[PDB]
Design a protein around this nucleic acid. Structure first.
Length: 493
DNA sequence: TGTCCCTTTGTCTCTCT
DNA sequence: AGAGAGACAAAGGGACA
């Protein structure tokens, strides 16, 4: 018989119990732990169900699932209950920071290494705890911490990088590989091809940073003479997760796409310059003629859809959903293209298909409004949040549907909507801002942190901004959000 | 296998102006 | 408002004990 049978059975026996107190996990959360943390992780969560939930740690189930759903999850769980007090008392980290460090493959290694190396990293190397946490919060975080300790001096001194740059390089999966490749390849890339340190840092600062740097070195000559690419265009392609794959695919498919479809190299670069660019290119080669047939989508529209992260997913989803969204939902092809032309286009298309009739019939929005909500990165999240929160925001908080749609119609719209529902009362009743001002602050990208920064300043006033009135602070917060307040917070110093 | 580390792709959020 | 950064997640492969 199949050997995985006993184990699968054990998985299900134990999984059944976890639906009960004190954790109560759903099928989705249980699948997740099983898929990545495996069987021993599911058994571990059960074994330490009580010791984590409340006294004296007090971890939410969502947090227990986050620690458990990785390779070694069992080990991370044991280590968290051991090291979270140590790290919150002896180094002053928050439980959230400890959880974030724990929530990656080999989390036990990262936590123990942070416990070991944080003092030497802050004292002898002048890093902040936040920076130590960031470095540590990726797979192989133990390796990245140890490589930062060893290579920070030689990277700042012999190679001219700032600590911030070293931290940025180190704070991805395979950070150790990226750091080491930069030490070796920075003079080669700078002095042989005229790249700035900053361009090299940008290449190095993604997962697979090492792969992308080595690929830039190899392919930069062939890309710049033969295919007529600018060093600037090559750097942009390489400056993305899986840069190596995007680069190699650009060399392959640039002439093919240009000659056979009439795309410019500028358009090709834009398709290639996201995470999964490789996938976006190969999909365009296949799918463009299919999308463009019968006077359907123009090439230019296919390029736009292609030119975002997961462009492959967006392209395929349009091919599937263009007819059913146009015909049965009364959308123009142009509107479908608008919704698809953002990171997560696939998610957003699917969510419009599912929710357009609900939001229209049940909540009284127009299609135009639904499209406007959908037509940003994270459009799925914003649509789901408008569905959840429109009744409370309008009925309990006074807002018009028009104001809710405005808040929702930017990247982070979900975050903006949730924060408004959360902070509207204290902003208006405790400090006298008008609802229209709160809406105004929140109706920009970065709505959430702009609102948080404002609430911070009115509940624990920094003298640095006391010279500003509430209205001035509002105008500032609408002008440039949290960064503008923060800058002002300094300009005064 | 269980654990650790590395790489790619997809999605979401905030910044920079 | 569009490009850039970066953060978080899901999933697969190498390595090894």
């Amino acid at each position: 018989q199949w050997s995985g049978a006993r184990a699968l059975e054990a998985l299900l026996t134990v999984a059944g119990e976890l639906r009960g107190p004190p954790l109560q996990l759903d099928t989705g959360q249980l699948l997740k732990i099983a898929k990545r943390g495996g069987v021993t992780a599911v058994e571990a969560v059960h074994a330490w169900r009580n010791a984590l939930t409340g006294a004296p740690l007090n971890l939410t189930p969502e947090q227990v699932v986050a620690i458990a759903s990785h390779d070694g999850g069992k080990q991370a769980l044991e280590t968290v209950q051991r090291l979270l007090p140590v790290l919150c008392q002896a180094h002053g980290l928050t439980p959230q920071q400890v959880v974030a460090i724990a929530s990656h493959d080999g989390g036990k290694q990262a936590l123990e290494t942070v416990q070991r190396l944080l003092p030497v990293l802050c004292q002898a190397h002048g890093l902040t705890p936040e920076q130590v946490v960031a470095i540590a919060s990726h797979d192989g975080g133990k390796q990245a911490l140890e490589t930062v300790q060893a290579l920070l001096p030689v990277l700042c001194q012999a190679h001219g990088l700032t600590p911030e740059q070293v931290v940025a390089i180190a704070s991805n999966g395979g950070g150790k590989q990226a750091l080491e490749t930069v030490q070796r390849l920075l003079p080669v890339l700078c002095q042989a091809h005229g790249l700035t340190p900053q361009q090299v840092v940008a290449i190095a600062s993604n997962g697979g940073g090492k792969q992308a740097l080595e690929t830039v070195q190899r392919l930069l000559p062939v890309l710049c003479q033969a295919h007529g690419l600018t060093p600037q265009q090559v750097v942009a392609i390489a400056s993305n997760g899986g840069g190596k794959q995007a680069l190699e695919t650009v060399q392959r498919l640039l002439p093919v796409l240009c000659q056979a479809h009439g795309l410019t190299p500028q358009q090709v670069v834009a398709i290639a310059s996201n995470q999964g660019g490789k996938q976006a290119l190969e999909t365009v080669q296949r799918l463009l003629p299919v999308l463009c047939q019968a006077h359907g989508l123009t090439p230019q529209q296919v390029v736009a859809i292609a030119s975002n992260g997961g462009g492959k997913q967006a392209l395929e989803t349009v091919q599937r959903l263009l007819p059913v969204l146009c015909q049965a939902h009364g959308l123009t092809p142009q509107q479908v293209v608008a919704i698809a032309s953002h990171d997560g286009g696939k998610q957003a298309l699917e969510t419009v298909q599912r929710l357009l009739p609900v939001l229209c019939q049940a909540h009284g929005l127009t299609p135009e409004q639904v499209v406007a909500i959908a037509s940003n990165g994270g459009g799925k999240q914003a649509l789901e949040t408008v569905q959840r929160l429109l009744p409370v925001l309008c009925q309990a908080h006074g807002l018009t549907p028009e104001q809710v749609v405005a808040i929702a119609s930017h990247d982070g719209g979900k975050q903006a909507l949730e924060t408004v529902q959360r902070l509207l009362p204290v902003l208006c009743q405790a400090h006298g801002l008008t609802p229209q001002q709160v809406v105004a602050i929140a109706s920009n990208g970065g709505g959430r942190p702009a609102l948080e920064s404002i609430v911070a300043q009115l509940s624990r006033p920094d003298p640095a901004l006391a010279a500003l009135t509430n209205d001035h602070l509002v105008a500032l917060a609408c002008l440039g959000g949290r960064p503008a307040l923060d800058a002002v917070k300094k300009l005064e110093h």
